[PDB]
From a paper:
DyPs (dye-decolorizing peroxidases) (EC 1.11.1.19) represent a new family of haem peroxidases widespread in bacteria, archaea, fungi and other micro-organisms. In the present study, we expressed [name] DyP in E. coli, solved the crystal structure of the recombinant enzyme and several site-directed variants, and used PELE (Protein Energy Landscape Exploration) to describe the binding of its typical substrate RB19. The DyP structure is formed by two domains, each of them including an antiparallel four-stranded large β-sheet and two or three helices resulting in a ferredoxin-like fold (plus two additional β-strands). In spite of the obvious similarity between the two domains, only the C-terminal domain harbours a haem cofactor.
Aromatic residues were changed to serine in the simple W377S, Y147S and Y337S variants (the latter with low refolding yield). In contrast, similar Tyr-337 and Tyr-147 variants (and the double Y147F/Y337F variant) only slightly affected substrate oxidation, and did not remove the high-turnover site.
Numbering used by the authors: 3 to 448
Amino acid sequence: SLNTIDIQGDILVGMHKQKQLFYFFAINDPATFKTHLASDIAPVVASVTQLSNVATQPLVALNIAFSNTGLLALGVTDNLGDSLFANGQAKDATSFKESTSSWVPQFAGTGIHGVIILASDTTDLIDQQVASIESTFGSSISKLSSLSASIRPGNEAGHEMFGFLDGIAQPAINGFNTPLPGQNIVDAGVIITGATNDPITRPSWAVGGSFLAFRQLEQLVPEFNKYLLDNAPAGSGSLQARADLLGARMVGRWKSGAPIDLTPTADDPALGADAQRNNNFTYSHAGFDLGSDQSHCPFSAHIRKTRPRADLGGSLTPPNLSAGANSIMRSGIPYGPEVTSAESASNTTTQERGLAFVAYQAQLSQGFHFLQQTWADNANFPPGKTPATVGLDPIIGQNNGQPRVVNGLLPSNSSASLSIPQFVVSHGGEYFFSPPISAIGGRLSA
Ligand code: HEM
């Protein structure tokens, strides 16, 4: 049975606060760190149960996760069953056709021992909690770096920096979530280590945790906007409307959240807002060949690359349940300033903004790493298409800094190719393990 009282809340629910801080730390004097981990952190770690009840959301929601080197600093030599986690993300960078030479230097190594995720409706409240932690831990905790993040303002609340509504699609955990139309339904052990049908044996104290893949993904927003205007397909509407269509073709949803598979030529903001309808699709359409039809959604669209649905078989009618083991829970939040007047006018980025990307999964090789390397970065994925060369994911697809060839985006001609510069630039990140709450004051403090 899924013991949600013992699972950290960001994993299955998300913090859902206006402001978040990712506080990346090293451990000194581990015996002292441990005493404070047990006395000061464990009691204020927010659980799934706590966050699932709108009446027990804490003022400051706190989660904590440890890198491989952080667990080792705590004297934990156990095999958590994940080679990617053990090796650290810097060693995995070439899997994604990037180089750590481009990373924030603190990520390009294994000095980071963990991350504290703090979330609250104001930054003052976060800062007070950080000050309390630094006060009680003293020098046994050392801040290496941090990243502040926020829900975007006004009509962009819940949208990422390019302007698209985010956080729509997640796997439903069988026995825990009430599935929405079209939502994949997966065994708990796809996300939670040691939960139902996790095939990898874990240390006993690690049952109820998850691996957290963090990526600091800069977004080149003025450049993206200008690209869409410059490449907008011909049509009856305003130039901006035609540019908007191209952007929707790249993501697989309109900015409103409406999936293009269900509304391929025009936005439907009412559909985008409706969780009962906005995920209710499989990419299959009766009367169309799944292997060649890109009129509803390109084969290269971001969401189609990252959850293939009927492209990997299974039910043609919703819900499609394919590739459940390749599911990830996403808890990303935007970072950086909004686009400034001068950046928009010059079509040029000056300040860094983007997505503080967070993915949870029980097996890094099946989740984030797989989606990036085997799907998004693979010009021949999905398989069995005509033309066979789908191209790269236009949002996240990487090829060692080169422009990406992306096919199928133009509704007028599915064979038309575009060469697209990166609009998302990796600054690196790390793989962490978010332990069950019991382990925080338990094994990890022993
Ligand atoms: C700055 C970088 C990124 C941006 C701007 C971005 C944006 C989006 C947007 C707008 C959606 C549609 C909203 C939704 O369906 O919930 C989405 C969905 C999704 N993204 Fe990305 N994303 C980024 C990075 C990533 C990465 C690195 C991965 C994995 C390697 C990823 C995996 C997914 C998945 C699995 C979905 C849901 C697909 C589905 O279930 O249909 N995203 N993203």
